[PDB]
């Protein structure tokens, strides 16, 4: 039993036939990543059953913009001049590729932050990573290799 | 105002110590190639001994914002220039372990533990603490050295 | 005694293939860590966001040709909690006793 | 000369080659074939030879034992990113 | 390398085909 854990591959060619070309892309990701767990899909199934500061920075163009309204509706803790979301998954993109996050937004007149996971998506692959996790990486690697070097100082 | 102040508070601090460990290694690497002559066993310990020291400060610099950075966990979005030539992005944003993780298992399995859970594990902790307390005994003996 | 301890401290050896292969080991096994400390210098370009950041960035010639300031993060102080509070984290501290033990064996 | 082998013939020949320890080694320490689950899945499919009437065709009995080992190992074997089988990295 | 590669049939052993197998075996029941 071996895990792929801290993001690895895609799901590829299988919704390449179903076709990836933005907007549909997000749903293709859902099958692929094995990472739609609650809200976005839940919204999907219920129907299937029968701005923000970052959003202002983002600005949504086409049908995914319509979905966005739906998602807010699904997940909005409400305060006087503010709304906060539970488990929505969403995206930011360009041309060949994009990046998407699954997040929680806290709002106010002069500031608003979404805490989430962010995932980049190029050519049927997802990236989800952490600095500090990122460092431990080639850092411990550098040192194990330096200690190979130090072990080689077994020279007279 | 369009885009965001993402992260990287102590990132500068990591970079500095990331560099010094790079800088001390790199220089040893350059010499390492003139295997025509090794620099004087004094010289190499001066460079490889402060080169290891460099990674202690670089080791610790990681923990000091250690709550902050694994929490920050930024994955890249960029110019699509990053998308051409591809891999560089996979490579440059990737955390792993090398063939390294393996002697990490050799070591983990070298301990006396693995799947026996919580109650027996908490006990082992108290026992290791007792070993550290028997290590205080070193304090007593050091007084004798006097 | 001092002369002989100084002899052992002269690196000195007359080895053919024996002496040869060993020093090649140093070259490659040291070089690896040198090169991986360069991934460490690439996290430097990863800052971007500042002029002093660009300075650190030019560290790669490929950064010299990969203009962007590229990356961004959010908040999982919760995930910091998970790193620290997990039963996995308690357990991982056992990997600390384990490697340390084998280090003591060495 | 004989015509090209049948699938049944190809698989019988192949399962039996696993009776050779060196060859099984040369595979275990391949790269590509462990990237994708295909080969792993193939070897489990080949356990069809372990029962009658199939097994009655096996001349090299060790290959069945080695297949079984090889198989059980794989389930818990950790696959490195390149293809390297993790639990074997120390050996040649 | 006088050591042969695994049989060409290996390419068919994808996890997608494995999932489709149980239903296929059924339908079949109805070189």
């Amino acid at each position: 039993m071996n895990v792929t854990p801290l993001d690895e591959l895609q799901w590829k060619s299988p919704e390449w036939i179903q076709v990836f070309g933005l907007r549909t892309e997000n749903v293709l990701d859902y099958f692929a990543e094995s990472p739609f767990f609650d809200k976005t899909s839940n919204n999907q199934v219920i129907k299937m059953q029968r701005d923000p500061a970052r959003r202002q920075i983002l600005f949504k163009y086409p049908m995914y913009m319509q979905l966005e309204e739906e998602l807010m509706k699904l997940d909005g803790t409400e305060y006087v001049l503010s709304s906060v979301r539970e488990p929505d998954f969403w995206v930011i993109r360009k041309q060949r590729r994009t990046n998407n996050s699954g997040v929680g937004s806290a709002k106010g007149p002069e500031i608003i932050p979404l805490q989430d996971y962010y995932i980049i998506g190029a050519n049927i692959y997802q990236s989800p990573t952490i600095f500090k996790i990122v460092q431990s990486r080639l850092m411990s690697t550098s040192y194990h290799l330096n200690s190979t070097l130090e072990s080689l100082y077994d020279l007279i | 105002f369009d885009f965001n102040g993402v992260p990287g508070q102590a990132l500068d601090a990591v970079r500095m110590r990331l560099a010094q460990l790079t800088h001390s290694l790199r220089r040893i690497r350059d010499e390492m190639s003139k295997a025509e002559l090794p620099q004087w066993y004094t010289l190499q310990s001066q460079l490889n001994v402060t080169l290891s020291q460099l990674v202690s400060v670089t080791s610790t610099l990681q923990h000091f914002q250690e709550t902050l950075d694994s929490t920050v966990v930024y994955p890249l979005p960029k110019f699509p220039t990053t998308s051409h030539e591809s891999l560089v992005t996979t490579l440059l944003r990737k955390k792993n372990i090398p063939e390294v993780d393996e002697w990490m298992k050799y070591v983990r399995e070298t301990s006396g533990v693995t799947t026996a859970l919580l109650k027996d594990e908490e006990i082992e902790k108290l026992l290791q603490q007792d070993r550290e307390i028997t290590n205080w005994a070193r304090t007593t003996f050091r007084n004798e050295y006097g | 005694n001092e002369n002989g301890e100084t002899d052992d401290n002269i690196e000195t050896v007359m080895t053919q293939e024996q002496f040869v292969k060993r020093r090649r080991d140093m070259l490659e096994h040291i070089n690896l860590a040198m090169n991986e400390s360069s991934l460490a210098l690439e996290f430097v370009s990863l800052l971007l966001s500042s002029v002093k950041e660009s300075t650190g960035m030019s560290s790669m010639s490929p950064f010299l040709r990969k203009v962007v300031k590229p990356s961004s993060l959010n908040s999982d102080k919760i995930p910091y909690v998970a790193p620290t509070k997990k039963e996995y984290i308690e357990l991982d501290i056992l990997n600390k006793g384990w490697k340390l033990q084998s280090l003591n064996e060495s | 000369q004989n015509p090209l082998p049948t699938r049944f013939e190809v698989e019988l020949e192949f399962i039996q080659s696993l009776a050779n320890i060196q060859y099984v080694t040369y595979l275990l320490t391949q790269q590509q074939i462990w990237k994708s689950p295909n080969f792993k899945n193939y070897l489990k499919y080949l356990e069809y030879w372990c029962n009658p009437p199939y097994s009655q065709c096996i001349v090299y009995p060790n290959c069945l034992f080695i297949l079984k080992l090889l198989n059980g190992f794989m389930e818990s074997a950790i696959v490195n990113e390149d293809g390297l089988l993790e639990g074997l990295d120390e050996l040649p | 390398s006088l050591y042969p590669p695994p049989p060409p049939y290996v390419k068919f052993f994808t996890q997608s085909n494995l999932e489709k197998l149980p239903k296929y075996k059924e339908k079949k029941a109805a070189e």
Partner: peptide, 25 residues
């Protein structure tokens, strides 16, 4: 001013950091 310029080495031919297991549909 740590040294002068910054030491290139950039590498995609290294051991490897990616695995692979979700290839199947």
């Amino acid at each position: 001013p740590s040294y002068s310029p910054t030491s290139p080495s950039y590498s995609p031919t290294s051991p490897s950091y990616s695995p692979t297991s979700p290839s199947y549909s």
